[PDB]
Structure formats: structure tokens, C-alpha cells
Amino acid sequence: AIHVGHHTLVFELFGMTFNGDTILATAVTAVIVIALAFYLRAKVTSTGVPSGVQLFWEALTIQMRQQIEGSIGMKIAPFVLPLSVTIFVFILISNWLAVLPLQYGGADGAAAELYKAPASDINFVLALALFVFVCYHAAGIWRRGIVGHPIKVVKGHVAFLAPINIVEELAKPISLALRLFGNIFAGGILVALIAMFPWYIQWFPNAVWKTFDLFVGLIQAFIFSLLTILYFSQSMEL
Amino acid sequence: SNFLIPNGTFFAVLIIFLIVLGVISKWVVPPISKVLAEREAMLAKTAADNRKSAEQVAAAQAD
Amino acid sequence: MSIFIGQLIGFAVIAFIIVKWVVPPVRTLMRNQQEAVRAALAESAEAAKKLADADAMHAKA
Amino acid sequence: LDPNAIITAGALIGGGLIMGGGAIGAGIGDGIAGNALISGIARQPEAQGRLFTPFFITVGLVEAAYFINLAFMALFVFATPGLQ
Amino acid sequence: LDPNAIITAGALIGGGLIMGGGAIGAGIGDGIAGNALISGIARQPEAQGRLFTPFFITVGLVEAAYFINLAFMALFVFATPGLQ
Amino acid sequence: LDPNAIITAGALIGGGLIMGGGAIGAGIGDGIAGNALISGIARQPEAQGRLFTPFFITVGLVEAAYFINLAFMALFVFATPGLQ
Amino acid sequence: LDPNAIITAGALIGGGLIMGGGAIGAGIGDGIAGNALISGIARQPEAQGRLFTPFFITVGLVEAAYFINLAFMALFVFATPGLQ
Amino acid sequence: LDPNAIITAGALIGGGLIMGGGAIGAGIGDGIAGNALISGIARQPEAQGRLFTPFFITVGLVEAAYFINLAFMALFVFATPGLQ
Amino acid sequence: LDPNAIITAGALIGGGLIMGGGAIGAGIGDGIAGNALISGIARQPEAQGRLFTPFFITVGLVEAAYFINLAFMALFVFATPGLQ
Amino acid sequence: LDPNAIITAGALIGGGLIMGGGAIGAGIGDGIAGNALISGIARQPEAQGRLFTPFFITVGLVEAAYFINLAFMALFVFATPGLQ
Amino acid sequence: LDPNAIITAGALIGGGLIMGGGAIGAGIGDGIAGNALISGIARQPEAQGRLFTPFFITVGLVEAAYFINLAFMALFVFATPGLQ
Amino acid sequence: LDPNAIITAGALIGGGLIMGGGAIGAGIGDGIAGNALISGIARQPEAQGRLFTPFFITVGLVEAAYFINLAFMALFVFATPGLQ
Numbered sequence A: 001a002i003h004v005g006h007h008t009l010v011f012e013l014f015g016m017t018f019n020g021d022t023i024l025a026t027a028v029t030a031v032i033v034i035a036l037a038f039y040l041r042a043k044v045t046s047t048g049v050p051s052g053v054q055l056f057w058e059a060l061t062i063q064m065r066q067q068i069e070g071s072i073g074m075k076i077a078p079f080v081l082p083l084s085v086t087i088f089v090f091i092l093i094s095n096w097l098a099v100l101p102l103q104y105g106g107a108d109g110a111a112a113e114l115y116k117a118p119a120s121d122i123n124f125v126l127a128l129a130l131f132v133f134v135c136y137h138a139a140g141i142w143r144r145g146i147v148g149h150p151i152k153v154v155k156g157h158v159a160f161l162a163p164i165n166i167v168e169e170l171a172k173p174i175s176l177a178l179r180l181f182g183n184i185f186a187g188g189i190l191v192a193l194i195a196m197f198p199w200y201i202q203w204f205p206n207a208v209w210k211t212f213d214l215f216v217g218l219i220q221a222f223i224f225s226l227l228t229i230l231y232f233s234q235s236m237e238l
Numbered sequence B: 001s002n003f004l005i006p007n008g009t010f011f012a013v014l015i016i017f018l019i020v021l022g023v024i025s026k027w028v029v030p031p032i033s034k035v036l037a038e039r040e041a042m043l044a045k046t047a048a049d050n051r052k053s054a055e056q057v058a059a060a061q062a063d
Numbered sequence C: 001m002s003i004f005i006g007q008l009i010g011f012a013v014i015a016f017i018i019v020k021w022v023v024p025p026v027r028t029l030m031r032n033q034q035e036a037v038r039a040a041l042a043e044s045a046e047a048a049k050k051l052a053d054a055d056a057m058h059a060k061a
Numbered sequence D, E, F, G, H, I, J, K, L: 001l002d003p004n005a006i007i008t009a010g011a012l013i014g015g016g017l018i019m020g021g022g023a024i025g026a027g028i029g030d031g032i033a034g035n036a037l038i039s040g041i042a043r044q045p046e047a048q049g050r051l052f053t054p055f056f057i058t059v060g061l062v063e064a065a066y067f068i069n070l071a072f073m074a075l076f077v078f079a080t081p082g083l084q
């Protein structure tokens, strides 16, 4: 009894369905991120030994700024730094919160998770990917003009490959979303399957898989942020 | 069914993300960039001060 | 319950691994960065004091 | 017999094909990218930092196909299209 | 027996084959192109930028096939040709 | 069983095989050609344009095969041979 | 059931296999030969005229293998042996 | 004819496909990564440790896919979705 | 129904598999051998002739397998063993 | 049509796929690792001693993938899941 | 429906798989060995006579496997184990 | 239909898959190992004597898997598990 899907806390509003579990997980991740941000704002110091949170935040900022400088000058695209930092920290926290021991028995032999990684929901990945898509297309329009930008994206580096380029433009958002989704969704299955073992055997495969899933989530967050940065760089040029 | 079908959840998630972005855009990245710039300026000032101390000592010895 | 017990034991193993073989190196890196920043601030302090001493010497001579 | 039985058998076989192809592609592409990374590090062992960015770009591009296939296999097997 | 069931099972198997092949091709081609990019960056760190233009000319093509297949797979399963 | 349904299922499976093989070939061939192009550009930047004439020949020969498969896929799927 | 339906489904599956294999072989072989050609031309411009001679020979042995398969698919799908 | 029999046969075939694809991908990717590791150790013996960090990453990225496939294969055979 | 129908469908599927494998092997082997030949001619323009004697051998061997498969496919398709 | 017969046929096909994939992966990965080892020993005769360390790791990571498949194959055909 | 018909169709498909795998393996292995031979002869022309000894070994092994498969294919299609 | 007929057809298809995968793996791995051996001998002719110890190991592993597959093929075909 895998019980794939089956969102809990589903409710209705404005003639639309909302998956309460995904909203709750996203809210918890946002609360954690905002708490870290305000703890930094309280303990940020340029004339003293940096605290752990300041070190972490400045490490992320330095990494993302280095990526931007490598791809497109920070002068051209300043906003990409906050956007990429937000994306990375959000995805990383959302994925790493899944390591906590919040899985139990559903009273029917099926595993139930109090907190599921929100990236396991198509809506979360779709929101992130579509926001990045619109943001970098708007940046391209700003840099190239409303008429110039579509011409440049259709033409690409080589003009006569205009069809392929078009597909590539549609390939960017989907690949940003599904990839993430997939690598998280699969994980959600794994734990559930591991929950079918007896308690005296479930611990070892569960421990191994979750220990590796920490690194997997870190890698996925980094990849999402880096791909967003280089998509912005491609959109904004010439 | 079809858990893969996009839902209204999408909009909700977006809003939350936007809020986080704002918090990052205003109270995380600008202060951190300012801290990094101040640290780099401090290092450059230290190097310049060392060089200026050296040259001033040399000039005092010479003149 | 059984699922909860198994996953709790798994989380205990995960925490043991992280504390034993992940926390030490990352804390070492954090301490190294803190020491680097502290040393930079100090070096700035002694550089300023050295420049003050050099200015005093120049004024004297 | 039950039409849904045949549809489900076909969906399971199709999902198996999807996942097998995705696994082959992911494994071979990740191996090739890791070979590039390891060879580059061996050539000049202090280039580790600057190679991880292109390596992870390659890894992301390779895993894109794998995890898109995983998502579509999940669609096939859990919400089968055209299932009567 | 419902003929639509046979047609739908065949369509699911065909879409599974399409995605398996697309995944294999995309993964291996992207891995190969990324291997080239990583080696070039390792040997010439200054090339970080100038190697993206050919790389993404390659990846694009490699992705194209995959996603083209994706479209047809959808057409196979969501609007099955020949399905009475 | 309607014979047309069996023929349609077979045609769909065959078209899926055609597209899978075409996608594998196109992806891997384009990846290899792009590896060659990226390596050539990395070794010497001035050759970029000079290398587009052969590279696009290779991609011309690879993609062509894919296209042919696609065409016949249509024949298999939209106007099925032998569909009584 | 009609024997012709089963025979036609089998013939379509066989033709799909034929073209899938042919496309895989043609694409990968053309990619490898083009990689050789691109690397050679990158090494020195003067070789471009000469290197195109062996290259075609390679493409002659590769593409030929494809087209033979293509021909046979026609035999499978248009004049099915043992169609009864 | 029990529909569960057909569903179980399809699930077994799909799980076999998943495991075969995972085995191919894992084996070839691990072989390629190990080839890079062996070549690096032969070229630069003192970089052995430095070369183990990327290698175990590649394996981690490769092996993981395998095990993911493995998990889903179990899901096919022990928790067959769509079982009636 | 007619035993010959099932036997002929199986024979066509088997012949399709045989030609798919033969085409894959022939294409990839010929591409690899031609890559070796092209690289050799590029590096050593004066080796043009000397590299045909080995290359042909390789091509011969590769082609051998392909054509052998072709023969057996005819045996599979035109004179099906075990037909009854 | 005994349900056990269909389930056993599906299990045998799945086990055959598992072993085919495992054999392909093991053979190709071992060949690549051995290529690395042979080249390293050829260029550095004295390196043999150390080169057996990474090699045995690579083979260990490849053969393992093989011998896991074996086990599950032994599970498919000797204790078939879902059998009744 | 004669059970011999089903058994013969299964045997034909199995023999087709055997020959397809053998053809792929033989073609690719012979191509790789010939690539090595051509590269070595280009590098060291006087080594030709010396390089044919290892080459004939490699091909030998490759060919061996192919031929073994062929033998078993003859067993599958001509004297099918399990006819009744 | 006779249950043993379906079981035997499935067993034959599974054995064909086993041998196809084993043949592909054996051929390609042997080709790669022989490529390494030939390249090593060409680079240093006198190294031949010491290059056979690793080569025989490589092939020794590769062939192992293949032969193991062969054994199980017999088990599938000559003593079919689950045969009624």
C-alpha cells in the first residue's frame, strides 16, 4: 500500500482546490528561512567575528555572486543574486526538512508522513519553474526590447536552427520543474517502500537512503539555482 | 485523481515564495553585500596603510 | 507504530553519522573562516597603529 | 476479460521501459561526466573548485531526462491515461 | 473484449518505448557534451564562457529530440491515433 | 476481437520503436559531434567558424536519419500499412 | 480472429525494430565519424579537403547499413512475407 | 482468465525492464568512473585521495539511480499498482 | 486460430530483432573504424594508403556479422523454421 | 489458461531481461575498467601494484550490480512474487 | 490452438534476440579492436606485424561469443527445446 | 492453451534475452580490453609480455558474466523453473 498522491488537508476556496499539506510544508519552510534571515539581520556585523548564520548566508551570497560574475556581470543583473539565493535556500530547506523522523503508521499498514517535501507536489515545482521562466523572459525583454527579445531567442546562436531554439525555450521551464519534482517524488516513494520492512529492519535502509537524500537535496537545490542563473545569463546578452 | 494535475495550490505556493524572496531581497542580500564590500575595503585599506607606513618611514629616514 | 519506531531508529543512525563524521569538518571550516576574519580585523588594527607611529616619527623628524 | 487489466499491464510495461531507458541514460551520462571531472582533477589537482560548476551543470542536464521519465512513469502507473 | 483496451495498451507500450529511447539518447549525449565542456574548462580555465556557446548549441539539439519524442508520447497516450 | 485494433496496437508499438531508435541515434550522435566541436573550440578559439562547416555536416547526417524515422512513424501511426 | 491482423501486427513490430536499430546505428556511427572529421579539421585547416575522402567512405558504410534496413521495412510493411 | 494474472505478468515484465536498465546504467557508469580513477591514479599517484572525492560523488550519483530503479521494481512486483 | 499466423508473427518479430541488432552493430563498428581511419589520415597525411589494409579488415569483419544476420533473417522470414 | 502459467511466463521474461541487463552492464564496465588498468600498466610498468586497488573497487562496484540482478532473477523465477 | 505454434513463436523471438545481441556485440567489439589496430599502425607502421597477434586474440574472443550465440540460435529455431 | 506451452514460450524468450545481453556485454568488453592491449603493445612493443596478466584478468571477468548467463539460459530452456 504505497498510497501515492492522496494529499491531506485538501480544502476548497474561490472555486479552486488547495492541497493543505503542500501549503503547510511551504509555510514551514518559509518560516524557517525568514527566521534565519531575521536572525542574520539581528546578528549581522561587518566589524566583528561573523556568527554561524552570517557565515552561511555570506557563503551562499559569495557562491551565487561568483556564478553571476562568471556568467553575466553583476552590474547587468543584480536581482539575479537575490533570486538565486532565495531559490537555493528555499529548495534546500524544504528538502532537508524531510530528514526529520515524522513518518508513522497509517493505522492501515500504510506509511503516513506528517511533513512531505513540498517539491514532491507538482504545484510547488511548477510555481518555482514558471516564476523563473517569466522572470528571465522579462529580463530578456528589458535588455533587448519587446520585439528584439523574441527575435533573438528564436534565432539563437545560429539562425537556421530556429525550430530547435523554439523547443529549447519550451524545454527550459519543464526541465526545471519535473527534474526537481522527480528526484523528490521518487524519494517520497523510497521511504514509503522502506516502511514496509519490519521495524527491526526498516532502520538501516531508511538511514542509508535519508543520509544520501540529504546530499541529493543539496545537489538539486544547487543545480536549480545554477541553471536559473545561467538561463538569466542567456536571456540577458547583446 | 491524477496527483500530477496542477491545482490552485500553485498560486498559494507562489505567494509564499514571493514573500520569502522579499525578505531575502531586502534584509539578507543587501546587508550581506554591504558586509562583504566593507571587508574588502578594509583589506585594501590595510594593504595601502602598510605600504604608506613603509614609504613614510623611508622618506623620514631619507629626509 | 512499527513504522514510526523503525524510522526513528533510522533517524538516530543518521544523526550519529552526521555528528561523528560531518559536524567536525564543517565546524572546522566555520572556525577557520571566523579566525581568518578575526585575523583580518586585527591586522587592520595593527596596520592603523603602525601608520600612526610612522606619522608620529615623521612629525618628530 | 477486464479491459482495465490489459490497460494496466500495458501501462506497467510502458513504465518499465521508461524507467529502464532513463536509468541507462542517467547512469552512462553521469559516468561520463564523472570521468571528465576525475580526469580534469588528475591533470591539475588544484582545479577541483572550478570544475564542480560545469560538472553539476552536466549532471543537471543528464538527470533532467531521468527524472522527467520518472515523473511520466509515475503518471503511467499511478494515473494511467485512457484507463477505462 | 473492448478493442480500445488493446489499442490503449499498445499506445502505452509505444509511448514507453519512445521515452526510453529519448531518455537514453538525451542522457548519453548530454553526458558526452558535458565531458567535452568539463575537459575544456579544466585545461583552459579562461574558456569558461567561450565554450558555452558551442556546448549549448549541442545540448539544444540533444534536448530537441528528447522533447520532440515527449510530444509524440503525449499524442500516443493522451490522444491515441487509431483509437475508436 | 476487431482486427483493426490488433493492427493499430502493433502499429503503435512499431512507431514507438522507430521513435525510440531515432531518438537514441540522434541524441548520441549529436552529443558526440558536439563533443568534437567543443574540444576543437577549446583547443583553439579561432577555429570556431571554421569548425561549423564539418560539424553541421555531421549533425546534418545524424538528424536526417532521425527525420526519416519520424516520417515513417507517421506512416505507421496515421496511415497504418495493412490496416484492413 | 483474422490471421492477417496478427501477421500485420507482427510485421509492423518487426519493421519498427528494423528502423529503430538502423537509426541507432546510423546516428551513432555518423556522430563518431563526424567527431573524427571535426577533430581532424580543428587540428589543421589543410586537412579539410583531404579528410572528406575517408569520411564519406565511413558514411558510405554507415548510411548504407541504414538504407538496407529501410528497404527491408518496406518488405515487412508493404509486401509482408507470408501474409497468407 | 483472472485479470490479476495478466496484471502480475505485466508487472513482472516491467520490473525486469527496470532492473535491466538500472543494471546497465550502473555498471557502465561505474566502469567509466573507475576508468577515470585508475587513469588518474596511474598518472598522479599522490592525487589518489584527491581523486576519491569526485569518484565517490559520481558513483553516488550513478548508484543512486540504480537503487531508485530497484525500489520501483519492488513497487512493481510486491506492491503492483492497479492490481485488481 | 491458424498456427501459421502465430508462427509468422513470431518469425517477423525475430527477423526484425535480428536486423535491428545487425544494423546497430554494423553502424557503430563502421563508425568507430572510420573514426580511427580519419584520425590517422589527419595526423599523418602520408599514411593514406597504409591505413586501408587494416581498416578494410575491420570493416570486413563488421560487415560479415551484419550480412550473416541478414541471411538468417531471410531464413526467419521467407522460409520459417518450424512452420506448420 | 492457468493464471500460474501466464505469471510464470512473465516472471521468466522479466528474469531474462534482468540477466541481460546485468550481463551487459557487467561486461562493458569490466571491459572499460580493464582498459584503464591495461593502459596504466603499459605506460607505467611499476604502477601495477597500486593500480589493483582502484581496479578492484571499480570491479567491486560493477560485479555487485551484476550479482544483485542475479539474486532478483533468482527471486523472479524460483519464488515468483504474485504467484498463486 | 496448437501449443507448438506458441512454442515456435517464442523460440523464433528468442533466436532473434540471441542473434541481435550477438550481432551488436560482435560489430561493436570488432570495430573497437580495429580502431585500436588502425591507430597503432598509424602511430608505429613497423609494428603492424606485431599488432596482429593481440588483435587476432581480441577478435577471436569477440567472434567466439558471436558464434556461440549463433549455435544456440540454431538450437532455438531448428531443434526447439520444449516442443510437445 | 496448454499451460506448459506458454511457460516454455516465456522461458525461450527469457533465455534469448539472457544470451543477447551476455553476447553484447562479452563482445563489447572484450573489444575494449583488446583495444587497450593493442594500444599498449603499439606504444611499447616489448611490454606485451607483462600486458597479458591484466588483460587476462579483464577478459576473465567479462567472459565470466557471459558464461554465467549461458548457464542460466540452459536452466531457463532445459530445466524450466515453474514448469507445470
Ligand SMILES: COc1nc2ccc(Br)cc2cc1[C@@H](c1ccccc1)[C@@](O)(CCN(C)C)c1cccc2ccccc12
Residues within 6 Å of the ligand: A161, A163, A164, A167, E061, E064, E065, E066, E068, F026, F059, F060, F063, F064, F065, F066, F067, F070
Ligand atoms: C533542423 O534539424 C532538422 N535537420 C534535418 C537535416 C536533414 C534532414 Br534530411 C532532415 C532534417 C530535419 C530536421 C528537423 C525538422 C525541422 C523542421 C521540419 C521537419 C523536421 C528535425 O527533424 C530535427 C530533429 N532532431 C533535432 C532530433 C525536427 C523533427 C521533428 C520536429 C522538430 C521540432 C523542432 C525542431 C526540429 C524538429
